[PDB]
Amino acid sequence: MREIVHIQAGQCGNQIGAKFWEVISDEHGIDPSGNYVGDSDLQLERISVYYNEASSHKYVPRAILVDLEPGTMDSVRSGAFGHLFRPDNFIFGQSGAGNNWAKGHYTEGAELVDSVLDVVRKECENCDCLQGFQLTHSLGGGTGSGMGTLLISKVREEYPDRIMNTFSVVPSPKVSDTVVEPYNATLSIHQLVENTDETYCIDNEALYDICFRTLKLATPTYGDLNHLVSATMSGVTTSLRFPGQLNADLRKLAVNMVPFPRLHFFMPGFAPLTARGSQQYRALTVPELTQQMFDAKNMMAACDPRHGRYLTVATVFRGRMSMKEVDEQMLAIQSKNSSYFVEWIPNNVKVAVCDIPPRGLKMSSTFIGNSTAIQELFKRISEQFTAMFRRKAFLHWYTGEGMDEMEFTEAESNMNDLVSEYQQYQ
Amino acid sequence: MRECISIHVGQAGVQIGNACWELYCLEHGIQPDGQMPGDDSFNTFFSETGAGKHVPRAVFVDLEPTVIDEVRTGTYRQLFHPEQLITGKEDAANNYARGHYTIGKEIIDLVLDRIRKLADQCTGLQGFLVFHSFGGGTGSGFTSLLMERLSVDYGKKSKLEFSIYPAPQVSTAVVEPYNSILTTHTTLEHSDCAFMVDNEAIYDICRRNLDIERPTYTNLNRLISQIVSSITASLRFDGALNVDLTEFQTNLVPYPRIHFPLATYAPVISAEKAYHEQLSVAEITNACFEPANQMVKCDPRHGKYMACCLLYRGDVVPKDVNAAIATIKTKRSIQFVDWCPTGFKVGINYQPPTVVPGGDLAKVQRAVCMLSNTTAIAEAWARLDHKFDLMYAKRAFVHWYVGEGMEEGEFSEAREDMAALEKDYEEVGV
Ligand SMILES: Nc1nc2c(ncn2[C@@H]2O[C@H](COP(=O)(O)OP(=O)(O)OP(=O)(O)O)[C@@H](O)[C@H]2O)c(=O)[nH]1
Ligand SMILES: Nc1nc2c(ncn2[C@@H]2O[C@H](COP(=O)(O)OP(=O)(O)O)[C@@H](O)[C@H]2O)c(=O)[nH]1
Ligand SMILES: [Mg+2]
Numbered sequence: 001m002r003e004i005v006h007i008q009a010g011q012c013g014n015q016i017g018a019k020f021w022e023v024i025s026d027e028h029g030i031d032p033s034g035n036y037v038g039d040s041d042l043q044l045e046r047i048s049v050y051y052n053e054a055s056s057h058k059y060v061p062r063a064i065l066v067d068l069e070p071g072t073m074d075s076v077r078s079g080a081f082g083h084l085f086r087p088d089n090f091i092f093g094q095s096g097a098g099n100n101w102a103k104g105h106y107t108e109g110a111e112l113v114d115s116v117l118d119v120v121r122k123e124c125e126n127c128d129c130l131q132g133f134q135l136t137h138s139l140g141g142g143t144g145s146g147m148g149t150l151l152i153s154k155v156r157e158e159y160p161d162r163i164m165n166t167f168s169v170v171p172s173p174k175v176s177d178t179v180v181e182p183y184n185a186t187l188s189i190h191q192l193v194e195n196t197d198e199t200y201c202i203d204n205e206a207l208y209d210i211c212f213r214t215l216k217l218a219t220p221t222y223g224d225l226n227h228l229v230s231a232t233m234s235g236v237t238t239s240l241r242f243p244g245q246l247n248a249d250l251r252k253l254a255v256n257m258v259p260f261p262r263l264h265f266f267m268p269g270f271a272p273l274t275a276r277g278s279q280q281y282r283a284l285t286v287p288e289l290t291q292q293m294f295d296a297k298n299m300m301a302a303c304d305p306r307h308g309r310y311l312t313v314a315t316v317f318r319g320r321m322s323m324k325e326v327d328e329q330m331l332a333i334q335s336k337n338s339s340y341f342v343e344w345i346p347n348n349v350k351v352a353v354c355d356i357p358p359r360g361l362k363m364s365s366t367f368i369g370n371s372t373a374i375q376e377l378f379k380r381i382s383e384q385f386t387a388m389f390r391r392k393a394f395l396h397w398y399t400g401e402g403m404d405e406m407e408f409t410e411a412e413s414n415m416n417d418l419v420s421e422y423q424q425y426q
Numbered sequence: 427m428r429e430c431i432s433i434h435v436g437q438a439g440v441q442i443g444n445a446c447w448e449l450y451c452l453e454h455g456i457q458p459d460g461q462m463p464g465d466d467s468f469n470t471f472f473s474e475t476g477a478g479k480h481v482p483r484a485v486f487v488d489l490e491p492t493v494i495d496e497v498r499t500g501t502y503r504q505l506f507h508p509e510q511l512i513t514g515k516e517d518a519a520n521n522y523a524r525g526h527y528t529i530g531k532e533i534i535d536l537v538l539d540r541i542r543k544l545a546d547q548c549t550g551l552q553g554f555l556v557f558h559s560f561g562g563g564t565g566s567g568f569t570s571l572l573m574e575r576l577s578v579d580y581g582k583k584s585k586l587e588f589s590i591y592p593a594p595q596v597s598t599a600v601v602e603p604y605n606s607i608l609t610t611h612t613t614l615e616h617s618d619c620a621f622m623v624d625n626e627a628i629y630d631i632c633r634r635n636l637d638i639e640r641p642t643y644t645n646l647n648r649l650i651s652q653i654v655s656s657i658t659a660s661l662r663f664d665g666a667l668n669v670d671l672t673e674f675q676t677n678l679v680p681y682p683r684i685h686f687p688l689a690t691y692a693p694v695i696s697a698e699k700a701y702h703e704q705l706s707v708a709e710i711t712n713a714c715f716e717p718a719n720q721m722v723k724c725d726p727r728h729g730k731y732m733a734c735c736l737l738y739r740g741d742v743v744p745k746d747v748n749a750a751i752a753t754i755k756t757k758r759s760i761q762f763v764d765w766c767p768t769g770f771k772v773g774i775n776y777q778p779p780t781v782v783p784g785g786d787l788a789k790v791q792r793a794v795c796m797l798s799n800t801t802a803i804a805e806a807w808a809r810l811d812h813k814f815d816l817m818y819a820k821r822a823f824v825h826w827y828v829g830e831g832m833e834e835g836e837f838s839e840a841r842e843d844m845a846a847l848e849k850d851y852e853e854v855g856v
Binding site for chain 2: 001002041045128129131243245246247249251252254255256258259260261312321322323324325327328330331344345346347348349350351
């Protein structure tokens with residue numbers, strides 16, 4: 001049936017991927033040993049989407065792990081869920097790109113992406129009907145950006161009509177974990193602006209603010225942010241893996257959410273977000289979730305949606321809910337928030353409802369918006385890239401890798417065209 | 427003898443179909459296993475095998491397995507013939523292109539052969555029933571294509587369909603206008619009659635009248651199922667006045683290009699109010715002609731009545747019925763077009779409107795199903811046309827359709843047809 005291939009870029013891709021497959025293992029009741037302990041048929045019904053049937057009846061998650069620094073994947077294998085993946089899914093080189101996009105992409109990704117592509121073809125042959133691919137990676141990282149870029153390009157080259165989406169970590173505005181980030185982000189975004197169907201933008205800073213503020217935390221680590229992001233990533237796919245009303249396929253969502261070919265960029269959101277002990281003062285209703293979702297503070301992308309307008313909005317619900325409540329809330333919200341939505345796009349909302357709530361909660365929801373706040377993000381990134389590019393900082397590495405300046409120039413031009421196109425519709 | 431084939435396309439059609447066939451099974455006392463522990467008008471809707479196992483006559487088509495698989499794992503999996511359930515490996519993605527053109531073309535042939543064999547089993551086959559959502563990709567495209575094909579194949583056979591009408595305010599998708607417009611284009615060029623239903627109006631009706639909790643698609647589908655079952659009940663039992671579908675085609679359609687009867691059902695009341703409520707034919711009709719009780723959000727007072735059909739069930743006396751109709755005619759808030767001496771066609775059936783077990787609707791000894799044509803629906807078509815006009819003016823989402831094999835001139839022509847429809851309604855409205 002409908003099946004998805006989950007490709008995990010090195011580093012955060014693999015880590016997030018680990019937590020992601022943990023979440024999925026919890027969803028379908030799959031034991032880390034590979035055995036199915038689940039009590040429901042719905043779990044095994046469409047399970048073939050993310051899993052394969054072994055002769056030993058152990059469920060192999062469908063994924064391909066790729067990194068240039070084996071240590072991470074070693075840490076993954078040492079993990080409890082590393083046993084689920086077959087040893088063939090682990091594909092890596094012994095030399096990291098060192099946050100160099102050109103190096104990885106042009107040099108160190110080619111061999112590995114060839115091997116990975118072979119494995120992809122295998123996994124693709126294993127599919128009855130392939131819906132598409134999903135890539136967990138990071139903008140600004142050498143391996144993720146370079147190898148992800150190349151791999152996605154080749155994946156589209158082989159599979160042009162298939163669904164291409166990626167969950168990408170965007171550069172934080174007020175902080176940075178690395179330098180040179182604008183270059184890598186720019187190049188990656190460029191090739192990803194042309195080569196994908198859609199992409200999701202999530203910033204760790206915004207996640208820190210959100211989690212700390214709403215969940216009342218103290219010492220949160222990357223695992224928690226990855227847990228949340230993975231909850232979202234699992235959240236969007238519920239309609240495919242479970243029955244409900246207005247079941248939304250990924251490409252249908254892509255069609256509904258994308259008004260124009262070049263602007264696919266989305267800002268995810270999630271509800272309910274509440275701290276322990278404060279939940280007792282919270283009532284779970286569609287209005288609550290919708291109010292949490294449409295709140296600017298809960299946007300996981302770093303920006304303020306108050307500046308811009310929504311071209312398209314998709315809201316997917318989980319658990320048993322009333323259509324009337326949803327409709328009324330969408331209308332009311334769209335009514336009071338008028339002028340925050342495009343005037344030439346009547347009914348900006350896209351609704352889908354899954355009957356199965358996330359484990360531990362009676363109900364939940366996920367928000368996916370499209371707005372020019374991302375144009376603001378691109379303005380920032382463009383500015384930083386310009387500033388760094390002017391004085392030719394760190395350029396010697398990329399030129400060392402044989403990266404021509406005209407590539408950077410063209411990329412910048414494309415970014416300018418992107419933000420321009422965002423300004424064109426507003 | 428007299429028989430009909432019920433087609434179900436899209437999740438809407440399938441679910442509505444499930445509720446519908448359930449209600450049929452209830453009315454005919456048939457169990458999910460096809461066993462039934464005077465009514466041969468059930469053979470009208472059913473066939474029979476060696477063991478006396480009764481099977482429904484229908485074809486379920488969804489390009490994605492989804493709800494049909496849910497039905498295959500459902501209670502009535504023992505009822506429907508496995509061959510009647512046809513599923514593809516992927517959806518139309520709310521894209522008219524795919525369903526009407528790219529995907530469904532590799533499917534529909536099987537469905538046509540299926541319907542053909544089902545039609546070969548028939549003797550006196552009167553017509554068809556097509557359940558689908560209006561603006562939903564699969565339903566829209568596939569029903570357009572299928573209606574074209576069936577229109578060519580079966581000719582004069584009655585073609586009826588129930589289309590879920592996109593609401594003025596609430597919307598489940600952004601691309602609904604495109605699909606709806608293409609749909610009404612290719613569908614108008616073929617379909618004999620189409621019943622429009624607005625979920626928002628159903629919400630209003632149930633919530634305000636039925637006084638229930640904020641509902642889900644279940645009870646809505648049950649209500650629509652009651653309406654459909656009422657019509658078929660007009661056909662499925664011996665009343666004082668029996669009405670063929672051809673008679674609906676005859677009476678409700680003044681012109682070949684205009685068929686859009688609006689359904690309204692009464693009584694709609696809570697189980698509690700039923701005791702304080704006294705249902706008289708006149709009162710039920712009075713309730714029927716109220717604008718708030720319409721299954722569509724279209725306001726009737728912005729137009730005039732061309733054709734009106736009233737189907738009665740259970741205990742009804744035609745005397746007070748015609749008396750009531752006169753009393754209704756005396757009302758000038760309700761106005762009829764000048765060139766129509768009488769827009770009333772009445773029918774009556776002794777079979778009462780049985781209620782679904784676990785149903786929220788009050789049990790009554792009589793009920794009325796109303797079908798009506800007005801130009802306020804043209805106003806509705808106007809607002810839809812406006813939405814489409816804007817969305818198309820900015821060429822939003824068009825690249826999908828185009829890339830999937832559509833054309834700009836196609837949308838243009840559809841728009842032209844819609845304009846023609848508007849002006850037709852306008853001219854007839856005079
Ligand atoms: N009244 C009613 N309408 C429904 C129901 N289910 C779906 N719909 C209508 O269908 C529209 C959504 O599109 P669908 O008909 O579900 O499309 P689909 O069947 O999934 O087929 P695709 O478009 O290819 O995905 C909504 O706007 C609803 O108006 C239902 O159970 N009852
Ligand atoms: N959300 C999330 N982001 C991460 C995680 N680990 C690293 N990152 C991000 O990835 C970036 C580091 O890039 P990296 O993958 O190490 O570059 P590379 O090794 O050359 O491919 C930092 O800016 C982090 O924000 C994680 O566990 N979760
Ligand atoms: Mg569908």
